[PDB]
């Protein structure tokens, strides 16, 4: 797949065994689907927000 989509696949994989927080479920879904964008600064932000390993998303 394209590199833009692998990043979205990584996010979906992080939450596969999880429930999404009611307050975050709309933004999370937008990121997974692509209706919101997903830059480098954002990727580090999300990784810190949920405690993902550094660089988990790319």
């Amino acid at each position, epitope marked *: 797949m394209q590199k833009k989509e692998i990043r979205r696949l990584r996010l979906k994989e992080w939450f596969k065994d999880k429930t*999404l*927080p009611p307050k*975050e479920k709309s933004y999370l879904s937008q990121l997974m689907s692509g209706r919101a964008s997903f830059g480098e600064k954002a990727a580090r932000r999300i990784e810190q*927000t*949920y*405690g993902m390993p*550094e660089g988990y998303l790319g």
Partner: nanobody
Amino acid sequence: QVQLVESGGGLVQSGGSLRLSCAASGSIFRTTGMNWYRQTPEKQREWVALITSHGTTSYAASVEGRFTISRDSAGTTVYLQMNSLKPEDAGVYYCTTRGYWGQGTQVTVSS
């Protein structure tokens, strides 16, 4: 680089309550989310709950409404409050953040 310490486990009667704590090096929980997992006699590593650096939370269906995840006032410690415990909540509970994992703490429910 990051160390994590779970505590608060022990023996508890069915229907009782308990509060687990997770300590994390470098005051990291002030600015970073985390997850709790548990390992029960049948099946392994089952996600339990999460709290983000924002303070927002989610729970597994099997504990939602009975477990509550929060930070202490300092923001350095995360609590997994449990109430209305059942024998099927027994297991080893692990805290995790940034890919690092605690040693775990055992919850035994009598009954």
